[PDB]
Amino acid sequence: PKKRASNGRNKKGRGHVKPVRCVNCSKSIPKDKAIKRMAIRNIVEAAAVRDLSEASVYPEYALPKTYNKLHYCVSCAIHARIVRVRSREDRKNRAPP
Amino acid sequence: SLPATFDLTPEDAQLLLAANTHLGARNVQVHQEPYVFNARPDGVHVINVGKTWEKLVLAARIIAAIPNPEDVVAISSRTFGQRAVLKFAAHTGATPIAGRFTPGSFTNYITRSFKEPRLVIVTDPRSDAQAIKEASYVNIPVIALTDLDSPSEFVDVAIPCNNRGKHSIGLIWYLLAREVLRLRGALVDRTQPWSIMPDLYF
Amino acid sequence: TRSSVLADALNAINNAEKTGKRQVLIRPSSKVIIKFLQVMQKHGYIGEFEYIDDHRSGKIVVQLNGRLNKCGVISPRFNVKIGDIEKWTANLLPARQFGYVILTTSAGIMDHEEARRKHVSGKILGFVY
Amino acid sequence: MENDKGQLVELYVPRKCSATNRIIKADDHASVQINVAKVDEEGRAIPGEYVTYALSGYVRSRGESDDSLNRLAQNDGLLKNVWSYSR
Amino acid sequence: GWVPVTKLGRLVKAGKITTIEEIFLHSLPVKEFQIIDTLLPGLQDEVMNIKPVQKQTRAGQRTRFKAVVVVGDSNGHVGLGIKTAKEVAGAIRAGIIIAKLSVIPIRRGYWGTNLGQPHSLATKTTGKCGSVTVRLIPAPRGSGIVASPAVKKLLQLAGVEDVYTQSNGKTRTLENTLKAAFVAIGNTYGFLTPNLWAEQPLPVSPLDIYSDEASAQ
Amino acid sequence: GVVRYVMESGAKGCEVVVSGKLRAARAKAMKFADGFLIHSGQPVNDFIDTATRHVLMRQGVLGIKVKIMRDPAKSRTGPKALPDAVTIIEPKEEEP
Amino acid sequence: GKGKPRGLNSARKLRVHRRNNRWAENNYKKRLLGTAFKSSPFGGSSHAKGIVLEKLGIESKQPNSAIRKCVRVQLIKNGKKVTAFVPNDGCLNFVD
Amino acid sequence: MRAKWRKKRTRRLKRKRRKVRARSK
Amino acid sequence: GRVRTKTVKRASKALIERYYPKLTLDFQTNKRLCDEIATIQSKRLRNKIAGYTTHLMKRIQKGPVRGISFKLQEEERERKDQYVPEVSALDLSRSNGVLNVDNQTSDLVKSLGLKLPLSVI
RNA sequence: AGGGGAUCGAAGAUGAUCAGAUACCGUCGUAGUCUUAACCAUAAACUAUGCCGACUAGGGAUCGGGUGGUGUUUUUUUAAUGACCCACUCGGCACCUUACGAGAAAUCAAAGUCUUUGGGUUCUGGGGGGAGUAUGGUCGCAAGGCUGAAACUUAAAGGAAUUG
Numbered sequence A: 001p002k003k004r005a006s007n008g009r010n011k012k013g014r015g016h017v018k019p020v021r022c023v024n025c026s027k028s029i030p031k032d033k034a035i036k037r038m039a040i041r042n043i044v045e046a047a048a049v050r051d052l053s054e055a056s057v058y059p060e061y062a063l064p065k066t067y068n069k070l071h072y073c074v075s076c077a078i079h080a081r082i083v084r085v086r087s088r089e090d091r092k093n094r095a096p097p
Numbered sequence B: 001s002l003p004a005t006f007d008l009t010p011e012d013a014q015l016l017l018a019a020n021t022h023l024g025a026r027n028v029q030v031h032q033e034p035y036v037f038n039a040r041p042d043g044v045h046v047i048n049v050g051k052t053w054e055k056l057v058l059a060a061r062i063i064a065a066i067p068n069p070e071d072v073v074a075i076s077s078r079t080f081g082q083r084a085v086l087k088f089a090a091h092t093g094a095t096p097i098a099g100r101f102t103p104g105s106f107t108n109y110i111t112r113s114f115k116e117p118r119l120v121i122v123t124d125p126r127s128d129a130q131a132i133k134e135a136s137y138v139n140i141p142v143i144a145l146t147d148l149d150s151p152s153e154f155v156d157v158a159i160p161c162n163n164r165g166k167h168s169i170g171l172i173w174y175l176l177a178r179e180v181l182r183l184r185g186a187l188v189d190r191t192q193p194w195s196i197m198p199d200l201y202f
Numbered sequence C: 001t002r003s004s005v006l007a008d009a010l011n012a013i014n015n016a017e018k019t020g021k022r023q024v025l026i027r028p029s030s031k032v033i034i035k036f037l038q039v040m041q042k043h044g045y046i047g048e049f050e051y052i053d054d055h056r057s058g059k060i061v062v063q064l065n066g067r068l069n070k071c072g073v074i075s076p077r078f079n080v081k082i083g084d085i086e087k088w089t090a091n092l093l094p095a096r097q098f099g100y101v102i103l104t105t106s107a108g109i110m111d112h113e114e115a116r117r118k119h120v121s122g123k124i125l126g127f128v129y
Numbered sequence D: 001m002e003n004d005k006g007q008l009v010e011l012y013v014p015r016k017c018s019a020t021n022r023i024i025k026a027d028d029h030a031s032v033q034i035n036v037a038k039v040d041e042e043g044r045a046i047p048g049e050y051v052t053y054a055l056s057g058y059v060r061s062r063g064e065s066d067d068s069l070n071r072l073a074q075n076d077g078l079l080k081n082v083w084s085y086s087r
Numbered sequence E: 001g002w003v004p005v006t007k008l009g010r011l012v013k014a015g016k017i018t019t020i021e022e023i024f025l026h027s028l029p030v031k032e033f034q035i036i037d038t039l040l041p042g043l044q045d046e047v048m049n050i051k052p053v054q055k056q057t058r059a060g061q062r063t064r065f066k067a068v069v070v071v072g073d074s075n076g077h078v079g080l081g082i083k084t085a086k087e088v089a090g091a092i093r094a095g096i097i098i099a100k101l102s103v104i105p106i107r108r109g110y111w112g113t114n115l116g117q118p119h120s121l122a123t124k125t126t127g128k129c130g131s132v133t134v135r136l137i138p139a140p141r142g143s144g145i146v147a148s149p150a151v152k153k154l155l156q157l158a159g160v161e162d163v164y165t166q167s168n169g170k171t172r173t174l175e176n177t178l179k180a181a182f183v184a185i186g187n188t189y190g191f192l193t194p195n196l197w198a199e200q201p202l203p204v205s206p207l208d209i210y211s212d213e214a215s216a217q
Numbered sequence F: 001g002v003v004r005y006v007m008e009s010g011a012k013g014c015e016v017v018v019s020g021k022l023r024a025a026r027a028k029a030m031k032f033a034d035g036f037l038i039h040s041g042q043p044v045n046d047f048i049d050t051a052t053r054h055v056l057m058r059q060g061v062l063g064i065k066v067k068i069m070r071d072p073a074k075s076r077t078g079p080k081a082l083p084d085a086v087t088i089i090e091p092k093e094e095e096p
Numbered sequence G: 001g002k003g004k005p006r007g008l009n010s011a012r013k014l015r016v017h018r019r020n021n022r023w024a025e026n027n028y029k030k031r032l033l034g035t036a037f038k039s040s041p042f043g044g045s046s047h048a049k050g051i052v053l054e055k056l057g058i059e060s061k062q063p064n065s066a067i068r069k070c071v072r073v074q075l076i077k078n079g080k081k082v083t084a085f086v087p088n089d090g091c092l093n094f095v096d
Numbered sequence H: 001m002r003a004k005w006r007k008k009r010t011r012r013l014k015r016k017r018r019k020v021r022a023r024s025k
Numbered sequence I: 001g002r003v004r005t006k007t008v009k010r011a012s013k014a015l016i017e018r019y020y021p022k023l024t025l026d027f028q029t030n031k032r033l034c035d036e037i038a039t040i041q042s043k044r045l046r047n048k049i050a051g052y053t054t055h056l057m058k059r060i061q062k063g064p065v066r067g068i069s070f071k072l073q074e075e076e077r078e079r080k081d082q083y084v085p086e087v088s089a090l091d092l093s094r095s096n097g098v099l100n101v102d103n104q105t106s107d108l109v110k111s112l113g114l115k116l117p118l119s120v121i
Numbered sequence J: 001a002g003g004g005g006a007u008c009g010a011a012g013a014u015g016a017u018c019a020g021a022u023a024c025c026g027u028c029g030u031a032g033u034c035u036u037a038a039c040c041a042u043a044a045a046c047u048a049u050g051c052c053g054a055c056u057a058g059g060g061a062u063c064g065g066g067u068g069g070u071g072u073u074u075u076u077u078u079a080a081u082g083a084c085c086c087a088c089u090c091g092g093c094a095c096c097u098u099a100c101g102a103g104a105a106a107u108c109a110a111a112g113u114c115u116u117u118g119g120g121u122u123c124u125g126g127g128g129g130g131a132g133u134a135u136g137g138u139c140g141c142a143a144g145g146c147u148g149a150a151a152c153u154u155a156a157a158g159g160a161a162u163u164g
Ligand SMILES: [Mg+2]
Pocket: A001
């Protein structure tokens, strides 16, 4: 029996999309099926900034973010925290957090 | 059938306009509503409150027809119209339901529950859908305070009012209260404002 | 493509009645839908209809009452000999007492009781009950 | 349904939806009969007279219960120009 | 004593309602059953089947018993009850009460020439349940009930004499074919024949005529 | 049958169990019950009386336990309610 | 539209497609191909005499265990050799 | 009995039948 | 460890509805009140109804607790009805006698009735 | 067959892991991966849903094109375009709600308008195996593709869902 109306995932109206490679796994996966997530974070973890505050010349220096977009195959995405099995009726939802 | 005692008096009119009972919803409005008058900028439709009043009269006339007016349930769960539903109840017979509907009321004949009305009025048909679903199991007519976006499903007479506002819900209940007794007893003098105040229903 | 205008017409009618509507517009109309509608009016499954003279093929608005169960076409238009009307009525019609399978004969388009008493037949058009 | 020698045979005889001339069958528990109290001089409820209206459960659930009630009611009086036969 | 609830249920022992056909006319929900015990008290009953069903449980094999039972006079009322319970006879008894609260009116008729005393069906009619279409077809007299024996018996209990039947689907699953036969005769009083075309006054409810006979003192 | 003689006699509840075979191959497990059976805590001593006797049927012996739940209210000795029970009253129609 | 043509003039394609599709019916296919003539140890007849070549024992399929007691026969009309069960208790002893 | 490979085998071991019916000339 | 069950919570509020006449914020007073009007079996049983009834009382002052009625909750909770009546009824007052309405909201008026305080936007 | 051959990498070579491990993992690495000129014709080539036509519910977005407005910015002074806004509409990718209808159910706006069975048409299926085998024909350089049985054997295989 058909589990999702999106079949695998989110492609209606083309026929063929193109493959991307899981960042953790290297497995081929169509772009529309990959599990995508942005690692928008500063180059500093918790604390370590006011341990660097007076460490810096340049009174006025902003904080540069480190940007990187990540694609997961289904299997990796499930095995990490990325997505989780959801109930039958819970699988129809597109709320991120 | 239709006398001019029940015409919309301009002093009655200023009651409705102060509440904004004539403001319909935005780009949302069920196809089953020609109760609309041509709409404003900023998206909001103006109800044709003449159609309100005529439906409200018929509402009243259907209620008065109920032989023993004790069994006429009137429902709110909506945070607002709870206060006004209880006031409406004591005036006529009018068994009330405020708070949560507790499903099993019209089916499921067990006590500490289970009115068996012959009519039912609802503040919000959307938010009181358990009663309107349940009523359609038991041959019970439904009267509803439909707004422009409100489901007409299983509702039998729609009162087009503005259900998304404080005073607008209370007004109709009191006007429906005033009308159902202007049909037998208290407030015999039509065109004579009822002793009672509308601001009580809030 | 449009192959039976009659079939498309009675489909709109049957779909109209089934949703509790009281009327339906039906493009594009013809000699033979009307006569069909007419034999349906004589026995009273609809009321007024108006032909609408557009200058191509004609819309039609028919007013329906609620007594209709089904009006359908039989396609293709089988040649039915007089003795075979008893066969079709048995299949298509809910009971002996009422309902009508309607034919087109050289004596015109008519229901089957008229056809039986006037005593002719020809091809078959449809049915109504 | 009478018979030969005219003596009627059918037990019971259903109502009919007012908006669809349909039939209301025994289990049609979405159907509802309406009573509008007919008024006279000063309303007075004319206790126990009514004008009567039946809606098939189907008409109720499709949403046309409300609007087919307005056309039904107004064409019988009961209502000013609230309904419009032309849309 | 019976001691009803249900504004209907009190109104029927008050004798203000005398025929079941007045409940049907107003299509009134019927939530008690002593009402129909009297309204028509000639109700026969055959249990059509008792059949084990199981629910697997950490120990295995619940095995409750299920009984399907049907009730009617041979005079145009049938009801059908499907109920299961732990002990065999407990399912039958509850099966009878629900067989009661279901009773439906069926519209008999003549095959051809309308003589006196109907024997057969108003029209062709069909009900379905699961895979099981069941078609009921008007028949000439002296033909009997040509049907499988579980339906021959139900149709006996709705007082029909001459009918043709034509099944389809998985009829070996008997619980369903009955359900479908029941939807079938249940549909006899839905078919708008020409001799029902006339407009009628809308008889006023017995919940309003004898409206005074609810509540308490 | 001899289950319900015990219930209209005025008991709060009653179980009858039988083990063995008359539908007779392997292992009866048949229960017959009604009412109420606090089982268990201390009220079992106070309010349930049980006795098992062994009936030797034709081709085996069958065990009938019976449990009876006397009405604790009319105990005529010791406690006259379960320690679950509570009760209260109010004043009559009074002066304002 | 239901898969097949309906026109008053499509008798050919209708008749010729039943002919095509009757072939997926085992009972039809076995008849038209005459495999009771070509195959089929008996001539397509109901019975056949034969000369008993030897008694013979065959173990049954499982769950069962037993020896079924067949004979081996050479059909007089055919040469073809076949095995045949001999019914009922004992009764193999009647076959020399 | 993965079909993909019940079917590789079915070919592996059917060209063999073809290539051995040609020895028999 | 210390979660009181419905035997106490039902019985403990079974009283407060019939005896808010009296009843105190002190435990040992209700302790010896309980067995006068109740039929508790054990002391620990009664001391736990009392400990909770007192607990409901030590909090009854500040807002009623869901599921209560004691002849005075009904009285005083009614007193806050009609806060605004005996002042402006929301007609031509809090307004300048005029009803402030918009261009199309207004056209709806000339349809049937005419007596109107006007405005535009 | 010529070009091209950075990368990845069937074979292969190796380091591990392993009871074994010419598997999974690690390092290599041939053909291949790209390309011109020829072949091949198949994929879970999938919406596992033929195409044409008609009709039957509620709702909000979006892509294209058009229509309308003293409408916002473009301020170039206002225009006029483009962008945007609101409203309509034809056409398209989809989606939400719901079934009134359908279905074995999962579900379905078609999978509806069917035992109340007929708008037109093309292809395919008839229990499971044996078998897409044998044979003939045909296409291919080949790998293989297209067409395609029978003996024989079997009481189930299977689909959807339920409880554990
Ligand atoms: Mg799966």
